[PDB]
Amino acid sequence: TGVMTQTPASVEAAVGGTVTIKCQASQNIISSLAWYQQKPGQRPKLLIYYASTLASGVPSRFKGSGSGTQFTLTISDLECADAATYYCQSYYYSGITYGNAFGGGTE
Amino acid sequence: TGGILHYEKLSKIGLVKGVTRKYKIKSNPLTKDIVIKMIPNVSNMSQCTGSVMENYKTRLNGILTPIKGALEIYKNNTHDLVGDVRLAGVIMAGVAIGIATAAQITAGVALYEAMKNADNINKLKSSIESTNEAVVKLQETAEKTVYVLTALQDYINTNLVPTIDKISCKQTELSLDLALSKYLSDLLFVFGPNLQDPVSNSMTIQAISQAFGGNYETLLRTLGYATEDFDDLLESDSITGQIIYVDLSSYYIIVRVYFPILTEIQQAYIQELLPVSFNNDNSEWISIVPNFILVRNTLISNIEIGFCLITKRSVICNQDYATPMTNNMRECLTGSTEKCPRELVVSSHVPRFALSNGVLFANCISVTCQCQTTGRAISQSGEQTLLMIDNTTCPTAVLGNVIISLGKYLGSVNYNSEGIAIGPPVFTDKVDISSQISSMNQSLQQSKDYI
Amino acid sequence: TGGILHYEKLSKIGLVKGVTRKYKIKSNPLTKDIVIKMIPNVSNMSQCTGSVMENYKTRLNGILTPIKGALEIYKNNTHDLVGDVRLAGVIMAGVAIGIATAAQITAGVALYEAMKNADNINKLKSSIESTNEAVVKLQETAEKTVYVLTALQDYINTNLVPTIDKISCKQTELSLDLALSKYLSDLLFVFGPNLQDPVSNSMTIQAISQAFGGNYETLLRTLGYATEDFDDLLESDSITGQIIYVDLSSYYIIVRVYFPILTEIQQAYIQELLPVSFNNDNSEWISIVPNFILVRNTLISNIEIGFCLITKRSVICNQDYATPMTNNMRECLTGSTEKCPRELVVSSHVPRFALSNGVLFANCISVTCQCQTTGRAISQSGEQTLLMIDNTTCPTAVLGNVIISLGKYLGSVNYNSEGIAIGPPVFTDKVDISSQISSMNQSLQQSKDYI
Amino acid sequence: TGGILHYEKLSKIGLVKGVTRKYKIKSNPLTKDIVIKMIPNVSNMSQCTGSVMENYKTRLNGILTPIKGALEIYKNNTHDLVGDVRLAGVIMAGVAIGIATAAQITAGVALYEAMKNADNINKLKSSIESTNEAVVKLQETAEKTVYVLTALQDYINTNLVPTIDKISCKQTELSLDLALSKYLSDLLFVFGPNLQDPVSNSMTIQAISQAFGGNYETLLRTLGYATEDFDDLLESDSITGQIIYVDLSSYYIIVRVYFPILTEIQQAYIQELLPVSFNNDNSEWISIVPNFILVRNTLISNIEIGFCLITKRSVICNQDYATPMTNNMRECLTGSTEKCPRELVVSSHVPRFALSNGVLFANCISVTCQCQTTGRAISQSGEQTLLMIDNTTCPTAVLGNVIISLGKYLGSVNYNSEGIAIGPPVFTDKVDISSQISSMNQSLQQSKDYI
Numbered sequence A: 001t002g003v004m005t006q007t008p009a010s011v012e013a014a015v016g017g018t019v020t021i022k023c024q025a026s027q028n029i030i031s032s033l034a035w036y037q038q039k040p041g042q043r044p045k046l047l048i049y050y051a052s053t054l055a056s057g058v059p060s061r062f063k064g065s066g067s068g069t070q071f072t073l074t075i076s077d078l079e080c081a082d083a084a085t086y087y088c089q090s091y092y093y094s095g096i097t098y099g100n101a102f103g104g105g106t107e
Numbered sequence B, C, D: 001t002g003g004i005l006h007y008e009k010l011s012k013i014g015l016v017k018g019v020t021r022k023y024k025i026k027s028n029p030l031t032k033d034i035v036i037k038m039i040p041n042v043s044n045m046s047q048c049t050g051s052v053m054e055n056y057k058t059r060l061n062g063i064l065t066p067i068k069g070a071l072e073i074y075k076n077n078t079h080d081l082v083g084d085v086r087l088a089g090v091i092m093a094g095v096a097i098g099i100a101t102a103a104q105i106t107a108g109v110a111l112y113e114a115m116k117n118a119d120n121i122n123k124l125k126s127s128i129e130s131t132n133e134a135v136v137k138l139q140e141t142a143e144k145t146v147y148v149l150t151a152l153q154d155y156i157n158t159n160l161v162p163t164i165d166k167i168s169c170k171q172t173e174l175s176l177d178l179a180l181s182k183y184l185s186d187l188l189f190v191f192g193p194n195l196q197d198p199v200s201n202s203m204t205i206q207a208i209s210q211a212f213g214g215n216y217e218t219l220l221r222t223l224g225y226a227t228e229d230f231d232d233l234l235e236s237d238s239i240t241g242q243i244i245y246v247d248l249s250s251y252y253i254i255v256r257v258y259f260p261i262l263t264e265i266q267q268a269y270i271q272e273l274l275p276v277s278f279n280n281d282n283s284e285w286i287s288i289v290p291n292f293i294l295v296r297n298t299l300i301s302n303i304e305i306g307f308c309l310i311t312k313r314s315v316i317c318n319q320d321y322a323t324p325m326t327n328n329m330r331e332c333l334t335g336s337t338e339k340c341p342r343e344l345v346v347s348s349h350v351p352r353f354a355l356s357n358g359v360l361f362a363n364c365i366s367v368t369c370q371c372q373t374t375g376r377a378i379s380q381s382g383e384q385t386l387l388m389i390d391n392t393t394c395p396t397a398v399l400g401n402v403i404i405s406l407g408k409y410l411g412s413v414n415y416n417s418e419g420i421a422i423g424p425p426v427f428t429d430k431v432d433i434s435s436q437i438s439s440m441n442q443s444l445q446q447s448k449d450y451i
Ligand SMILES: *[C@@H]1O[C@H](CO)[C@@H](O[C@@H]2O[C@H](CO)[C@@H](O)[C@H](O)[C@H]2NC(C)=O)[C@H](O)[C@H]1NC(C)=O
Pocket: B438, B441, B442, B445, C327, D425, D426, D436
């Protein structure tokens, strides 16, 4: 099946610093990864799709990277409003191979 | 090669000697396998796929399942017993097969021999599904490098993903569905119900390549085939492929390409005769005689040239296309010109002269023959069928509006003076042949009733 | 099904019993109409059209006008009188038609029956011109939803409008003109002067779909056709279309798709014989006999298989392709083996064994027959034509390099010991057939003159 | 045109008179040259070409070299002597040519006549290499404006250069290589070893245009050809091209398009007969007779219609396709109905009525004939073969489900009462024809041995 190993579960970083989140897929997903932002008591907010493309209206300090099995999410120039739980998800659909899963999440 | 066809008498009845070609037949095939993915990778444009890919998968499964079952009929009933000195091959379950031709059974044996490398290739099944390029090379231990061709993958990568920004998602989805449907429409002619016996290595690689849009050049060059007779093998339908595995879950197939080498058939040539209309009894005629004669070990036989590739140097065939010849035709080619039939010429356009060994053979009654050297016309009497024009008669002849210089004829010095016996007239039209047969039955029956 | 072909004697002369297939013929067509727009909508790229669209309109009108006139010949001369109990159909003006075949008149009747839904569709003419998508669905009152396919519209939308920014207007105009000209070059083979009788429902949907780039899969799936025999109906040329309206002002046409269902012909089967070379008089021979025999109500007739689709289970045809058989051929298939002719085998490659009901029928003089069970060779004397190999003689036979296990033969226990009478030899080559006919006329004439 | 076929008796044996068409044959060709560049200009995307262009150049040289050598065989051996009053043409070296047909020598003459404009065009060789558009026009002194078509140039300009930003360089290189390989796969069928004699103007322009993707419409409209019979000339294979120059260094060729005009053959027509099954001896039959008869100067001959284009008005052919007819067939068409053979009808579907001059000719035993005017059925006795239905018998006839009004028959008033003599039965199947021939040899031999 498809699973997503997202590290780390939680992380601390000062305002103005950079934080790195990583997502690992059990199978190759060919750059078909998304990144979401979720604040407590709120619906998720789309951040990045296709591992690199930034969603409209999302600050450029959120930077996604990766291909295949390994992907990273980097948040530079950290702000107070950035504190939230961050998830990744695979929407891989070659046509014959189905890979869909959510990351465990990073606080 | 020598002469056993009595070409002089044949020339007098309008059959001019043509080019002598070699006889080459395919043999010793070189086997290479290749994977063909019938479903493109749409991961980079998955948002606009909709349900198109599911419908396409259903249709492609409907197409592919009969091929898999036909192959399984032999795969399930072919057993590889533990090898030893008593048996050197595998056994075919004749009762289980039930009814099969010799070629089909040999193709089943070939399918078994393919099964080994087919199993080796299928170890990379997860990698095959992950491929997103039109042509890709798979390496894992530098052993039997697997090549994978994917259908429509180049269209997905160069025409739909680049324009995904520019056009709406529904437009992109419709374009994808149209591409898949056109691929199915073109692929159906080869892989549909027309493909009755998938257990056969007789299908040409050009037909096999329809799964890859008919780009057999890419398929062949990817596997690394290279030979001087690449084009000669291709055009003579000698390069063939065989489906050796079908995956209904992943929608890909493995084909085994049979690449042979041309071998010159020793002590064999193929002589061609150029038909020319000759005049007899104030009428024009054409000898109804094999234009291509196969001679092998000085044995005259007919040949089914239509299935062969004719080049200037040789005749290339994917099998022996020799056919028997009746004794009367062989006696006429032997030199009994009264045995070759002829047919009336009523068409305004028919070959009325030819050129062999620098010597002309012209119907100077139908055409206007003039001698450019002497400046006087070349006339042909009614008693003679053809006219031989050479250096003794005319150094530079003029046939219509062509001016050709001639050589010297090497036959009888009195060719135009000797003459020969004309054969019988015939009618080659189909309904005419039926009419002739029926009138013959009536004449024979009247004679028998008189008896 | 039963046996009426005397298969044992036939097997002795090299005709091995093959698969028995059903007889299926199309019938009961399901009619659906669809609009095909032969001119794409270029409104979104009108600046780079230039005069290309006008030239294309002129050329397409030149192509389309003869079709419209041919249809009008029947449309103008077909009158629908006020229906009542005295007449139940429409009348055809025979004097006005002048000369017509039966099929052409029936097609004119079908054109009339189409005219109703054709008029309903043409109410949406303004909407048809406004369509800018390759496939579009038209709804107005949920009555007879009209589908419209537009040629080259997908190319306009996905390849020219997206790149209009990237390339010059002259480049885009040239590309558009090239696309239209290629469409005309490919469409001309089907809709040009080759289409002599547009008043006919005999043209296959694959040919009809050339107006839509040959994507007949999209055309058929859009109308919603679905059946288990979709591929069988397609490949057997049973799904046909008929042009029922041509608009020269708007450059679109309406075609009526005839989608039939296959019906099993009761009390009828089609038996196949597998030819195998047999030895006689130190020579190899092949029986010149119908490889496919049609039996219906225990009546043997020939069949024109070439126009039918052969599957493993049945023979699918778009009409009855039965043909008569001469009484001598029927008597040989009946069991008079001296009535079937034979032909000399000179080719190095010809089927020399076959497998039926787990039993082998091999020319063990031409091929090397060995018994894997006993370890000794299987020899065939000169007096016997073929060799029957089964479980009594050899449990596991080896033919060349194939090892096949066998069943038990159910015929005469002394098959290899009985023998049969060989027929006469023949020559099937075309020029050879003419030569044989002519020599026959000469022999018959000599006999008559002696009488 | 007149009547010489005795159509009444023919109608009684199921041959209904059809349409009378003219006879048109091509002549007087108009010659225009055009350059075809087989290699696209990739200068604007040179970074992603890699080694693809070198491999393509090598392969294309391998393909093109034989054509150049074949043309050089005639070019090197054709000499233009200083013109004067003694000679008005060029001389062909017969000894150097060796063996050649008449058509090949005439094609060599045409190649010479092309060489002048070919040399004029080749003066612009540097400009030809620099062209980067699919269609380009070359002017230098307003003399013989040279047109240049470039293969795949539209794909380079509209699909690869615009997407060079969007996809990787390796992706673009693979797409380019795939395009070139597909072009080679499609071009090989026409320009590969299948093209044996490049010294010939007999190849159709549609085949020639495969070097330009088969867009012969662009090729023809660029040169400026325009005629009412454009489509008629195209579909009848009358517009032909000839390769007159091959450049192996620049990978382009020059072809000479032969554009003829159709000429009506005076005092000649082509009559068609509509076959209809007629009943005799409680059986159905079809006359085995030429469905198309050529009459020219009141001389009946067969015609090879298959190579001609049939339109409603005339028969268009690229040469004279007349063939002789046996005297028995000509006597039957003359009016001796016992000379035309017939064949048993066993198929469920065969034409059983036809319509000529508003008069019906129906097998009212097989079909149900009813008179809509009188309301009573139309019955046909067993003694009569066909039924003539016209205004005297039935003003409005009903054949199956078609209702057709009729005219008045102009033949004998007692057509249905006179009757005629039926011919002999035949069997047209191939193996059946061989069987009949063989049984005839056996009967004739038994009779000779009795003598
Ligand atoms: C050739 O003519 C003979 C005439 O006797 C045909 O022979 C028989 O034809 C009659 C005609 O009705 C049949 O009833 C018989 O069954 C036939 N056979 C025998 C043994 O008498 C013969 O069929 C004709 N063949 C061809 C090919 O035209």
